[PDB]
Every structure is written in C-alpha cells, then in structure tokens.
Amino acid sequence: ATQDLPPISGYAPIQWKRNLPSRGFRPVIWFLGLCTATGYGFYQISLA
Amino acid sequence: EEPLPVLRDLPRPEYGELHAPVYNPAEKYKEQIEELHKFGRYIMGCLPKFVQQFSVWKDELVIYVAPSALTQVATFLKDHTSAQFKACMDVTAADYPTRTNRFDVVYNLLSVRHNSRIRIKTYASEVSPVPSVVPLFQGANWFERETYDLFGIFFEGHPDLRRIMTDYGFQGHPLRKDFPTTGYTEVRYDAEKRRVVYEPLELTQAWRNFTVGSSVWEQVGDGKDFTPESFKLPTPAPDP
Amino acid sequence: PTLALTSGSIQGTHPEGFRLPRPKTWEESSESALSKATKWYLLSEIFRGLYITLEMYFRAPYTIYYPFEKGPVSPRFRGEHALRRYPSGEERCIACKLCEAVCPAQAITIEAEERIDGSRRTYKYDIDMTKCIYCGYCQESCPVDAIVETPNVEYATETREELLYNKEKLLANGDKWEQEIQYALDADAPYR
Amino acid sequence: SMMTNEQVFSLAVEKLLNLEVPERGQYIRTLFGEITRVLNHLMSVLSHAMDVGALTPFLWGFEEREKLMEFYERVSGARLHSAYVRPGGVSQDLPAGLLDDIYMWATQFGDRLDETEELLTDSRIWKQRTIGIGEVTAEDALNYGLSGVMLRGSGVPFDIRKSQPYDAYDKVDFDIAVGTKGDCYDRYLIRMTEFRQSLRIIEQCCNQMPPGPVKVEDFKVAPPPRALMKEDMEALIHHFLLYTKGYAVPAGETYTAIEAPKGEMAVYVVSDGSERPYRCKIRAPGFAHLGAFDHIARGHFLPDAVAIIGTMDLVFGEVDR
Amino acid sequence: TNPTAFAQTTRYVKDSTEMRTLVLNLYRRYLRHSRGFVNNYNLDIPASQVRTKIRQEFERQRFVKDLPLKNVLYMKAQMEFQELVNFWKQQCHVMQYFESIKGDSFVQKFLKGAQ
Amino acid sequence: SSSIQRTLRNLWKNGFKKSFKQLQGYNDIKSGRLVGTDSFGNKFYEVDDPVEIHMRTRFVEYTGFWRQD
Amino acid sequence: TDLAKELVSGAPKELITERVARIYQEAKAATQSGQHNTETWKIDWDILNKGNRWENDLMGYQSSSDYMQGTILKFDTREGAIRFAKGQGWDYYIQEPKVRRFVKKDYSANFY
Amino acid sequence: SGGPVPVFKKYTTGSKGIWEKIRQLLTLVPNRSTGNPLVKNYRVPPPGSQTLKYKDPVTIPAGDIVKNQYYDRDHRRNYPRLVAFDQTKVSGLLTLGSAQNPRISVGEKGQKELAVFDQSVSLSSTLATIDPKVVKSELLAEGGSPVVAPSLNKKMKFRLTEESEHGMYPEDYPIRIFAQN
Amino acid sequence: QAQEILIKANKGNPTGLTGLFQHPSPRPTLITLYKATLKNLEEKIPKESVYRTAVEAFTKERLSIVENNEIIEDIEKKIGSGLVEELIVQANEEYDLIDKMAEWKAWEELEEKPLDDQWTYFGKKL
Amino acid sequence: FWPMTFGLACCAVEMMHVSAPRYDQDRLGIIFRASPRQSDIMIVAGTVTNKMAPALRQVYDQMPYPRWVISMGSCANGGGYYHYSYSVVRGVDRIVPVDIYVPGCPPTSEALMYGVFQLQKKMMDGQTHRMWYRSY
Numbered sequence A: 001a002t003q004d005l006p007p008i009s010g011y012a013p014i015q016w017k018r019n020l021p022s023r024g025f026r027p028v029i030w031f032l033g034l035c036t037a038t039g040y041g042f043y044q045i046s047l048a
Numbered sequence B: 001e002e003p004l005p006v007l008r009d010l011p012r013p014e015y016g017e018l019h020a021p022v023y024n025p026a027e028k029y030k031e032q033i034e035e036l037h038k039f040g041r042y043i044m045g046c047l048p049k050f051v052q053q054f055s056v057w058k059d060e061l062v063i064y065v066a067p068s069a070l071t072q073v074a075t076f077l078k079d080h081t082s083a084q085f086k087a088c089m090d091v092t093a094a095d096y097p098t099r100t101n102r103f104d105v106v107y108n109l110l111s112v113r114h115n116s117r118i119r120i121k122t123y124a125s126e127v128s129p130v131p132s133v134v135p136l137f138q139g140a141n142w143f144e145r146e147t148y149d150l151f152g153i154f155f156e157g158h159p160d161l162r163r164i165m166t167d168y169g170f171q172g173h174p175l176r177k178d179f180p181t182t183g184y185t186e187v188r189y190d191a192e193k194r195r196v197v198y199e200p201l202e203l204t205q206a207w208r209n210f211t212v213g214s215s216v217w218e219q220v221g222d223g224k225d226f227t228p229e230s231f232k233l234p235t236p237a238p239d240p
Numbered sequence C: 001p002t003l004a005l006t007s008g009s010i011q012g013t014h015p016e017g018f019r020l021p022r023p024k025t026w027e028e029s030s031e032s033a034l035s036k037a038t039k040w041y042l043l044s045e046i047f048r049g050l051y052i053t054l055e056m057y058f059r060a061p062y063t064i065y066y067p068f069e070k071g072p073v074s075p076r077f078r079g080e081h082a083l084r085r086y087p088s089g090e091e092r093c094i095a096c097k098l099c100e101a102v103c104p105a106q107a108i109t110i111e112a113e114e115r116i117d118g119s120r121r122t123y124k125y126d127i128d129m130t131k132c133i134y135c136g137y138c139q140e141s142c143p144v145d146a147i148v149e150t151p152n153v154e155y156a157t158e159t160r161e162e163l164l165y166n167k168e169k170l171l172a173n174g175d176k177w178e179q180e181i182q183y184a185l186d187a188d189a190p191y192r
Numbered sequence D: 001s002m003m004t005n006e007q008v009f010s011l012a013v014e015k016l017l018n019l020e021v022p023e024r025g026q027y028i029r030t031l032f033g034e035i036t037r038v039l040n041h042l043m044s045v046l047s048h049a050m051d052v053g054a055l056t057p058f059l060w061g062f063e064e065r066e067k068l069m070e071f072y073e074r075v076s077g078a079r080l081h082s083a084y085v086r087p088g089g090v091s092q093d094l095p096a097g098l099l100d101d102i103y104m105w106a107t108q109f110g111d112r113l114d115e116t117e118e119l120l121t122d123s124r125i126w127k128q129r130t131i132g133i134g135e136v137t138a139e140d141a142l143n144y145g146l147s148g149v150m151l152r153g154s155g156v157p158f159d160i161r162k163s164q165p166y167d168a169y170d171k172v173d174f175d176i177a178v179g180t181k182g183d184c185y186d187r188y189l190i191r192m193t194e195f196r197q198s199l200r201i202i203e204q205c206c207n208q209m210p211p212g213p214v215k216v217e218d219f220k221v222a223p224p225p226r227a228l229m230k231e232d233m234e235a236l237i238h239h240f241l242l243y244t245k246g247y248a249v250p251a252g253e254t255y256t257a258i259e260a261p262k263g264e265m266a267v268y269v270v271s272d273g274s275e276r277p278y279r280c281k282i283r284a285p286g287f288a289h290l291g292a293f294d295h296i297a298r299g300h301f302l303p304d305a306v307a308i309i310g311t312m313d314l315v316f317g318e319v320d321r
Numbered sequence E: 001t002n003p004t005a006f007a008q009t010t011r012y013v014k015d016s017t018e019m020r021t022l023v024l025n026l027y028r029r030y031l032r033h034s035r036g037f038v039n040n041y042n043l044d045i046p047a048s049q050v051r052t053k054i055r056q057e058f059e060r061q062r063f064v065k066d067l068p069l070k071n072v073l074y075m076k077a078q079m080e081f082q083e084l085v086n087f088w089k090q091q092c093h094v095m096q097y098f099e100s101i102k103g104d105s106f107v108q109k110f111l112k113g114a115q
Numbered sequence F: 001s002s003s004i005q006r007t008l009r010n011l012w013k014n015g016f017k018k019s020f021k022q023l024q025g026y027n028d029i030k031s032g033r034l035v036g037t038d039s040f041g042n043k044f045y046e047v048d049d050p051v052e053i054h055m056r057t058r059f060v061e062y063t064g065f066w067r068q069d
Numbered sequence G: 001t002d003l004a005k006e007l008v009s010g011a012p013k014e015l016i017t018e019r020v021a022r023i024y025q026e027a028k029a030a031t032q033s034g035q036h037n038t039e040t041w042k043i044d045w046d047i048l049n050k051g052n053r054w055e056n057d058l059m060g061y062q063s064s065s066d067y068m069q070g071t072i073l074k075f076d077t078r079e080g081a082i083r084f085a086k087g088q089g090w091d092y093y094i095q096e097p098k099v100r101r102f103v104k105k106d107y108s109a110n111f112y
Numbered sequence H: 001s002g003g004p005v006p007v008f009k010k011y012t013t014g015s016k017g018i019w020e021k022i023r024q025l026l027t028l029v030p031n032r033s034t035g036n037p038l039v040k041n042y043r044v045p046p047p048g049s050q051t052l053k054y055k056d057p058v059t060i061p062a063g064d065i066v067k068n069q070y071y072d073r074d075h076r077r078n079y080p081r082l083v084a085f086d087q088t089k090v091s092g093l094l095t096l097g098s099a100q101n102p103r104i105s106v107g108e109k110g111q112k113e114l115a116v117f118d119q120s121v122s123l124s125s126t127l128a129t130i131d132p133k134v135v136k137s138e139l140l141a142e143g144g145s146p147v148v149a150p151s152l153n154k155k156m157k158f159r160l161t162e163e164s165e166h167g168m169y170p171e172d173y174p175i176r177i178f179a180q181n
Numbered sequence I: 001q002a003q004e005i006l007i008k009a010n011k012g013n014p015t016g017l018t019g020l021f022q023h024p025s026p027r028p029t030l031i032t033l034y035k036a037t038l039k040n041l042e043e044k045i046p047k048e049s050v051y052r053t054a055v056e057a058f059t060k061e062r063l064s065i066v067e068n069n070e071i072i073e074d075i076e077k078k079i080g081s082g083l084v085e086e087l088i089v090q091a092n093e094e095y096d097l098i099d100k101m102a103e104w105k106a107w108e109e110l111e112e113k114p115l116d117d118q119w120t121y122f123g124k125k126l
Numbered sequence J: 001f002w003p004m005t006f007g008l009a010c011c012a013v014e015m016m017h018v019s020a021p022r023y024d025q026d027r028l029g030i031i032f033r034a035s036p037r038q039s040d041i042m043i044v045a046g047t048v049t050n051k052m053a054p055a056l057r058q059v060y061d062q063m064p065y066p067r068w069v070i071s072m073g074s075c076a077n078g079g080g081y082y083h084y085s086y087s088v089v090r091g092v093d094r095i096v097p098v099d100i101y102v103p104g105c106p107p108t109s110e111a112l113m114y115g116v117f118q119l120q121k122k123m124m125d126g127q128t129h130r131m132w133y134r135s136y
C-alpha cells in the first residue's frame, strides 16, 4: 500500500528441513562388483 | 510446473487508520516485581549478618553487601537449592569519585536452574582489597583481571592478576574518571633508534568538548511509584 | 500450591525423555559387518563428497568483472561526502553547525560568520575523511540537505593529505555528483 | 553480528527509557536478528572448517553472505556497519520490495545448507578432527560462564531467546538443539541446526510482518520525519535538540542480555539522568570463552588447538572491546 | 586452569615486617635474571647497569608509612617482574626503559616559552 | 554464461576489433545494446542474453586500451 | 584519604608538580533561566601558559599538548570534591559560588 | 512444513529442455538449486526505481490531533522510582505487616509504632523476637517453604521431539531438538 | 561412624549432560544425605535462624518424596529440580553450606553497616 | 600481487569478501600469503593499537623488497572512530610508509579493489632499470 508488506495470502512455504537422500547401490552390491572385477581381472592376467 | 509468481504484483492488504494501545511499559513487570521482592527479602532474612540492603528494579534484583560479606553471600547464592546461581556472567566496576569508596564492584549471577538472574553490589576504595570469587567461579579469572587493568582494584585471592587489555607497562587505570580519554602518551616510529618509541601526547586537533552545552533544565521528573502494595508500611488510620 | 515445598520450580523440571537410553553395544548395530567395511574400505561418503563438488563445476559462477561491472547499490548508500546547492546556485548550508555536533567521530570542523551581503554562511568547512566513520549522521541532521554522501567509493588517494576535504573540495564534489545525488534523493525521499 | 550488537544496546537503553518499540519495529529487529545470525554462522562455521582444511565450503557460503549483506545495505546504506537498530526502534522503514527479496533468497537458501552439510557433516576426516576434541562438561561450562552454543553442546538446554524473550522472539515458533557430548562435533551440529531454525523464523517474519511505525511515536526520543520537520514548528525544535543535545535517560542502571550468535552478550549501562551514559560495560561472549581455553586445551595437540579456537567463535573485537 | 610461569598468589599482607622480607627477596630475583634480561632483550649495555637501575626504583618508595599503600606497591611490584621474565614486553619497551636521558635559567625558559 | 557457445555468439556479434579489446581489458567477450556515452567517452551497454547471471547484465567499454580507471 | 593515593594511580608526576586544578560549581548562564547545571560541583584544570592551543598550519585545526583540556569531573557534594582532590595530592584552589540575595517580588508593587 | 520442494518452485535459474533431463539423470538430489538468482525476478525493479509512494505510518492514539495529550503517553517520565529496602524497612514491614495486610494500631497509638521503625532496626534482632507464624506467613512461603528464585519466563518449558517432527538429524546423531510444549 | 557415599560417578551410562554419569544407587544415597542434613542442621544452627527453618522445610519434603517413590521418574517430577544424579549434588552442597553457614554465624547483627554516603547515586538515596 | 594477511578488525571482513566468489581477487592473480617472505604487499586492515604497533613494524621489516603498503579503512588511515583513545595509533603511517590510502568504514570490496588497481597502475609506471641508464 504505502509500506513494504507481505501479500494478502502470504508467501508459499519454503524448504528448511534437512534434504540429503542417500544415493548408490547397497553396500553388498559394491562388494560383489569389486570381487567380480578382481576375478575378471586375474582371468585376463592369467590368460596373457 | 506452473510458472513462478511475480511477488511484486500479488495483491497486498489494505488498511485504513492504524490503532495501537498506549500503556506504560513498566506495568508488564508487575508480577516480576513482587516475586523478586519476596525472594530478595528471603536472602536478607537468611543472612542478616551480610546483606546490607536489597533493591528491585523492574526484573532485576540487587543485593548490596560489604567487601567482607562477598564470599559468604556468593557461596550462599551458589549452593542454596532455592537459589542455585552456578554461573557468574559479569564482574565489573564503576567509578564514583564523590563517594568515599569510589569503585562499585558489581557481580551478575545466572541460575540456569530456575531461570533467574541476581546482582551483587559491593564497594571498594583505591587501596582497600576485595575478595576474589575465582575459588567459587572460575569464569571470574579474566573479569577480575580486566577490572584491575581498568580500575586498579586490589583483588585478594586471585591466582594470577595482571594486565589483560592495556599494553605492558601501561601507567594508570583507564576507566577511572580522572584519567583523560586520550591518555597521556602516544607512539611513533623513530628513525634514529630504529624502533617504535613512546612520546608525550600531542593532538593535531585537540578534542572538542561539546558536552558543556548540556540541558540547563531537568529533563525527567521524579518518577512513578510501582512498589507492590504488599511492601509498603501501612498508614495508621485516624481514630474516631 | 506451588513446588516451593520441595524447592523446585516448573523451570527446573526436565521434559519427558530427557534421560538418555542405554548406549548400543557392538551387537546392536543394524549394519552387517561387511556393509560397514565396504563403506569403510571404499570411502563411501568421500566419493559422494567429490561428486557434489563436481556438480558445481558445471554451474554458472558468481564472479563479476569489476571495474567493468559494479555490485548493486541502493539510494541509501553512504559514500563520499558532498556539499550541495540550490537550483538558484546559492550554497545550501546555512552554517547551522548541527552536523558538527552529531558527528560521532568529530570529523567536521565548521567556522562561520555573516557573509559580505548579510547571509549566514560558512567560510571554513572541513571533513577529516580519515576520521569519518561513514555513518550518515551528518546527512540525517542537516535541515536543508546541504551535506550528503554520494554513492562514490572509488576515491582512494596516494597521500593522506588528499583525504582532508576542505570546503572547496566538498563543493566541487557536490557539483560533480549532483545528478547522482538526485537519483538517490528522489528514490529515498519518502522513507526519511 | 553487527545488528545484534546494536540490538542489545537498544534494549538496554529502551529499558532505562521505560519505552517499548512498536509492533512493526520488533518484527524488523527479529527479521534482521536472524539474518545477522545466519551471517555470523556462515562466517564462523565456514571459517572454522577452513582452518581444519575444507577450503571450498567457505567459498560457497560467502556468496550467501554477499546476498545477505545486500539486505543490510538496502535498508541502512552500509554493508557492514549499519547503524540501523537504535534505541527506540530502527533508523528507517524497509524499502519497497525488500520482503520479496528476503523470500526469494529464503526459498533457495535451504539447498545451500545441504551442500555445506554434504562436505562436512558425514565426512570421516571432519569427524576425526572434531569428535572427542574440546570436550566440556556441564559443570565446567556453568562455572566458566560458557554461553550460547558452548553450553548447549554440553547438554544444558538454555537459550536467552526463551529465558527473556525480546523483540518479537515470543511471537514466532522455533526449536533449539542441545548437544550431549560437549565436543566440537556437537557444537558443529547445533550451529547447523541454528541455521535451519533461523530460516524458519525468517519465513515467519516475512509472513507476519505488520504495518505501522517502526520507531517510538515519541519525538522526544526519536527524530521526526523530514517532511514534518520542515513544516511543523515543534518537529523542528525536537529535531534540533535530538541531534545536538541528545535525549536524557532517567537515572539508574541495567543489565540487558540477548542471545547473540556467539553466545550471551550483555551490557551494563549506568545512567545519571544526563544525555550520556555514565558507564557501559560490555560482556562479550568470546571474552568468557577465551578464559576457558586453558581449561579445555589441556591435553591436546597443536592441530587440536586450531579446532578449539574455531569452535569458540573468537572475533577479537568483542574480546578486546 | 593453571597459572603461568613465575606467577604468585595475590595476598594482602597485614604486617609491615612480613612485607620487607618479600620486598628484599624479590630484589635478588630481579638481580639474578639481570644477565638473562640483557641476553633475551639484546640490550646494548652490560648487565652491570641493569643491576644498577633496578636498585634505584626500590628506594623510590622506601619511606611509605601507611600499610594499604605498601601492599599495592608490592602487588604491582611482582607484576612488573613477572612480565619481564616471561619475555612478554617487546625489545622496544625495555630499551626505552633504560634509554631515559640541570634546569634552564629563568631567562632561558622565558626565552623559549617556558611551561 | 560460461559455455563456449556464449563466447562464440558474442564474438561474432561484436566483430574482431571490438572483441579483441574485450579480450584485452574485459577478459570476457560480451555483446550488448548500446545505451549511451558519457562526457569522458565511455560507452555503456546492456546485455539481453537470457543466460547472463544476475549482476552481469550491464557493463562499460572504457576509452583507453591498456588501462582502465 | 590520608594516604598518598597518587602513588598507585600511575598518573604522570606533572599533575602534582606542574598543574593546578580548580574545584568550582558552575555558574548560572545569563542567556537561559534554568538552574540545574549549577547544582553539581566540578573539577577542571587550568590551561597552560603556552601550548594550550595553537593553529595547525595545514588545515587550521586547534592543536594542543594539554592532555587535561577535555577532562571535567562531576560531584554531588562539595566535600567529596575536596576529599578526592586531597587524596590525589592535587594543588587545587576552591572557587566559592556566589549566592543570590533574596528579594520578595509582588505584583501590586508596580503601583505601590 | 520444511519438506523438500521441487526445483522449479525456487527462485533460481534452472535448465530447460534436453539439459534438464541430463541434469536430473546425473545429480545426486535433483531438487537442488544452482543458487544463481532469477534475472527476471530478483531485484528487477531496483530499490531506486520502485513504484510505491511511501507514507509515514501513524497509529491513532499517539498520532492523532485529538484525544492525544502528551502527558497521557509520556512514559519516559513515568519510570519506576528506585527504592532500596534496608534491614530497617524489612523489620518494619515484618513487624507491622504491609499496607495491604495491616498489623498496626490506629490513630496516635499507631503513629507511635510506625515511628519505632523510622530509625535503625537491625533485622537480626527482629527475627529472634517475633511470632514463628510471622516467618511462615511473611518471610517464608506456603507454610515455611523457602522462596525459590523467581523465573524470568514462566512459559519457558521444553519437550523432546523426534526426527519425524523436527526434520533435523536422526536419532543416531548426538544432539536432540527441544520444542516448546 | 564411617558412612562413605558416592556423589558423582566417574563411569557408567550417560544422563544427557556431559560429565554427569548415571548413579548406581540413586535412592538410598539421597535418603542418607537428607537424614544427615536434618540431623547435622540442629547440631550447629539455632532455631531462631530462618535458614534452618528453610532447609528443614524442603529437606524434609525431599526426604518424604524419595521414600514413597521407588520409580526414579516419579521422584524427579515431584521434587522438580532435575535428574536424580543432580539431586545428589544439591543435597551434598546443601550439606556443605551448613558447615560454612554455622561458621559464619550468619544469623547475627550486620557486621559492617554502609557509610551514610555509600548507596547514594548522583545525590539521591537509593 | 600477493598481499600479506594482516587483517586486524572489521576491515578484514571486507578483505575476505574481495576473495569471495563475487569479486574473486584470485582471478587477477592476487593470492593472500601468510608470511612476509612470500608477500610483497602489506594491507593494514583494522585498528593499529599501541600494543600491536611494535609487532607491525617488525612484520614490515621482514618483507623483502620491493614492497608496498596499503592502508585500508579509517582506523589504519587516521585513527577513525578511535582517534581520541588512549590505546590507538592515530594513523599507521606513523609506523610504516604507506603507498596508498583506501577510505571508508569499512571500504567496500570494490573500494578496496580500486585501491589495489590504483597501486598496480603505479607499479607499472615504475622505471627501476631505466633510472640506472639515465638518472644514474
């Protein structure tokens, strides 16, 4: 009006709680992937 | 996925003429005034040998004690369950040269227990020592170190009292009223001596004292009476 | 009846659940041994920490290329001082000495007398720009808006003598920055 | 923490003056009491991390500081030393469109805290530098007068915005976080919570902002508006005497404490019925913290001292007032 | 919390004789460290003058009678020692302490403005 | 605002000599609508590019080449 | 009181030997009719016979080497001022304020 | 509440088209804003080019031309007077009661009693010689109970929340979030 | 007599406050110190002192609540002064005070009255 | 242009903001160094007290040539708000030679960069080696 005021219906709510969703596969799957790479790697070393 | 609103253009409330009640801000402390008065008297009754007097202002209770009554009253207010002031927030002083003991040492205690603050006032002169509360409150080690630096108060029982703020070998205690605001000396780099040297004070523009043009009329009245009606001596009513 | 009977208060009473439970032992960890060791040996959170930092590498930076661009300024900004004029050309200051008395740092020196034609004007007016705290009190106290702070900030000087603005210097600033002072005065007039 | 500094002098003087700020003024001092709190922790938490080694989280936050200092300059005219809060209220009213900028910054700022908590909260190197470092017991904290976060890290749930609510802090709803281990990692978590509680108050002050005067409607303690000054005789008299003689404060004394971002900051102002304070002792939280440094650093290594200084938030202007 | 090096408790003495023993004891402590004062502060004068000027300042207060004045001058007596030992003062301060230096006739002071 | 496309479009709009000067003092290759020239001779542009960041939508072209004040 | 308290104040010796203080009560100003600034006793120091004020050559300031030029003390009793001056060992001199003589003033006196 | 908010609902610059789909496929948390403010929204009418004509706000009772006498709202001169209670006045209040609960005779007999406590009366003696009911009724509280330190905030209480409510760190992290209750 | 009690455990489950461990025997320890304080109060502090009446007011009250409340959580909410481990230190300090309170003889006449000009600020009596 | 991190008080906060992302002093080759040996610019950002004064001279003497000193803000320039204090040096140019004075309380980040830009223009005007050929 003649002052700095919020709108009639107010402002929309904002995000202020923690937002850190975890990412990546389960820890077991990464270990399976590691022992697959190790097994395949020594297969190719043993082949050569 | 609607486009974001332009918050500049959204409608704003319309108001006509605004109304705000006018009432004395000191009224809202009324309940706090009585309870501090009761608890202030309680300490005096428990320790009549030490508490010279107590005073209440709005939501602040002050206990006035002698220097020889300090350790006793401080200990009582720290250990008594009804008043557990484990935390000492401030140790300071003030200079009133007109009084015989100029320095007025003030302690602020915090009770995280009951959510209260109490104030201890104890006087001191230039040469008379004051008991140190460091054996009770470890947080007063530096607050006492600062008060001596700026007021020269002798604190008896302090494990290590020394300058904390002013330079080493600084002459005079700055916050004493007789000490000029610009001090006595100043430093500069002397080419001959290859070192920074002290010289007597000499201002290129002398300080201007505009404080002389203070008010010649008294500006605030005698005040108002806000003592609880349970702490005034009753008037003996006239006879028939 | 209050809890003064036991020397207790509402404030001293802790909320429900305040006492901590029994800390878990090594047999109450939900993670299996291998899961806890795969995260430990393969640096689970560190590789995530790198990945979040690498997201910023593909974002627009914040840097602006000063002096070819300038950060935002507002009409209330306090900068270099300037003495203003009326449109007719007469100096705005009537040597009232208000600004000298507000000035927290005592940076202003005013010497005044009756002008040659009778006007109440000042013949000496200095600001010790190395003593001013750029606080805006002189500007607020001037009854005729004679002393203002222009939005200028780029006036660093080689010698300190050049930072003792005398009345000639401040009036030369008021002429130089008159257009920009009007920009700020027009915008922020009603708020004062 | 520039504006909270001048809020504790305003509260003390208004307390001595028996005056109360109008409703809108109190919301502005809460709005900029939390913008200032966000400004402080961005400086404190992120420079603490910089000492520990994390250089990048410093830089990300300091662009938020640039965005927040713009609000300082838009209302007062100075980025840092805004003499905005004064005894009786604030200097000027908010400029048009400031609320819509505090909001637009507030919508995004939540993600800026997450990207800070990404690099530090779960980092094993960060937790090795802080967990078990600088431990403080509740008995020791109360004895040395440790306040603010270096008392709620030790487990004590005390906060001055609750013990003595001031300037619209009683109207908004917000939580506090209390530690349990009294170490640097607990104080790190509490500060990161105080970020999100500030962003929770800041939104409410954007929605509950009332209209009306920002300062006491008492021209004998607040300067009259310039337009009224140049047209009304009594305004000119009061404008004259306020800027030369000052205003008299009734005699007495006070001790006003606020929950400063560093801790409990308080002033002991003694009045004499004159226009100049007779005494003004300033109780800086950092000064009481730095005394307890010897009692805490006893039994730690040189890389551990750097953490303890950062977890104390020692800005030495307050220590050496 | 523990006190720093060469620190002492602050006790207000109540006997005159007790103080002089403390006063005399403290004097050798100044004298004992005199060579180290020169070495640590790189003083340009031999340690003999350092011992020389220490003694003079003790005598300056010798004739105080009232007791409360005696303590404060002793409390500050210890503090100056403690700062000197621990290398707290800088070289500039100590040099200027020992680098200090007949009045003019009435005409001479009158000629140059006097005081 | 950092991609080489934004530098390519601005490089082509200005031409060589205008862009070479910005490659010498500005360190960035920008192009904008000319708004006016001041008494000293500097020219002030405004950037219409939708990708330019918040504080970089206005700039100057100083009169000199090796120095700017 | 009786003690030579100045030996603990750290003040320069010249305030005892070379300067003179004055204990006075400020007089009523002719311009204004208020009578409040004349109810507290004050201590001020005499100016110096040379070097109290001199014009700075560059900007025309008021340079000074007197470090007591802007030091005025306040009291509420005359004795406290004298006692405080005695304690510091100051070479003071007291200026007794003048006392206005009472004269009754009557509205009717303009004709009688 | 402070729940996560979709990125296109925040006032920051965001990608469009094929790059938006790339941005969502590769980012850890797709609703995280770049932080670069919207050029078309943020500060678009600068503080020096607004449209609002400001008007000085004035609440009616203190800004009115009528019913607005200054002595009604002159709070600076209605400050609470400073009263200090010495031992003597405590004794007088203790022996004679208060103004609300009088324990003093009337007329000249009462005026005799008040004058007794108009000069020094040490409180140590007063408690030694007075009815034990007086202490339980005046000095102490609730029948002899002590006087607990008064609270600056009678509404200061706390309660424990949990992550489903306070949204902060889960139960494993070593801090707890306290609400008001 | 030689009855040795534990005031602050140095090991055990935490209580939520740093440095304040859980007390192995909360209830018996409180009862021992409450009974000692009531006993030791009368040994040294006379009856006319209000302080003696004040301690016997609530040390009795805290002694009666402990007996009838075997559940620790019922003790805390009814005393209302924190955790039980804290109440031990309150009780202990309540005991130490009487040893010093008796020594100070703090029921007697004001040892040192202020001078006539002490609590006067700027020409007004406080 | 590697300065020395000699921030003392509130003037140092603006000094750090020059290095922040918005202004990014590093983009111009400015890296704050923590040692006189690796620094050639001394930036006095804050109040110079009497107790700090001898240390400031010692730190200044330890900088290898060529060296320049910038005075930032009102405290370093001429005392500023604390000009009439008993523990403040009224201008750091009473202790070290100052090559350029940046005015403000505190100077804005752009005001400090203008001071740095002004000094660089002066350093590019030096003729240290042509002086030998002509003046010597």
Ligand SMILES: CCCCCCCCCCCC(=O)OC[C@H](COP(=O)(O)OCC[N+](C)(C)C)OC(=O)CCCCCCCCCCC
Binding pocket: A022, A023, A024, A025, A026, A027, A030, C038, C039, C040, C042, C043, C044, C045, C047, C048, C050, C051
């Ligand atoms: C493949 C080669 C590149 C990556 C090499 C390193 C692998 C690290 C993850 C294994 C360790 C671990 O512990 O993995 C498991 C962990 C943690 O899972 P959680 O917290 O229990 O998940 C919670 C519950 N869920 C399973 C339902 C979600 O997942 C991660 O943190 C994944 C991190 C992915 C981002 C980092 C990769 C990109 C780095 C740079 C590549 C150029």
Ligand SMILES: CCCCCCCCCCCC(=O)OC[C@H](COP(=O)(O)OCC[N+](C)(C)C)OC(=O)CCCCCCCCCCC
Binding pocket: C040, C041, C042, C043, C046, D124, D125
């Ligand atoms: C069998 C498969 C073999 C795999 C081999 C790989 C092992 C690597 C190390 C894992 C152990 C570990 O991270 O240990 C963490 C150690 C010591 O931790 P601690 O003192 O024991 O406490 C934690 C464990 N607790 C609680 C069980 C006792 O310190 C660290 O934070 C080291 C972090 C180094 C990070 C360097 C940056 C990485 C750069 C490369 C990627 C860009």
Ligand SMILES: CCCCCCCCCCCC(=O)OC[C@H](COP(=O)(O)OCC[N+](C)(C)C)OC(=O)CCCCCCCCCCC
Binding pocket: F066, F067, J124, J125
């Ligand atoms: C073993 C060591 C290997 C070499 C090391 C490299 C050093 C880096 C070079 C410094 C550059 C510099 O400083 O360029 C900028 C400086 C400073 O310009 P100014 O201060 O504005 O004054 C100069 C301008 N006036 C006087 C007109 C105001 O000169 C110049 O404008 C140079 C302008 C002409 C350049 C002609 C170059 C000819 C071609 C050379 C390549 C084919």
Ligand code: SF4
Binding pocket: C099, C102, C103, C104, C105, C106, C107, C108, C127, C131, C132, C133, C134, C135, C136, C137, C138, C139
């Ligand atoms: S801005 Fe403030 S400090 Fe500077 S000249 Fe004006 S009143 Fe004085």
Ligand code: SF4
Binding pocket: C092, C093, C094, C095, C096, C097, C098, C099, C100, C110, C138, C141, C142, C143, C144, C145, C146, C147
């Ligand atoms: S306030 Fe304005 S009119 Fe008065 S002396 Fe200062 S500049 Fe001149």
Ligand code: SF4
Binding pocket: J009, J010, J011, J012, J045, J046, J047, J072, J073, J074, J075, J076, J080, J081, J104, J105, J106, J107
């Ligand atoms: S000049 Fe101003 S901003 Fe700089 S240090 Fe001094 S007071 Fe702080």
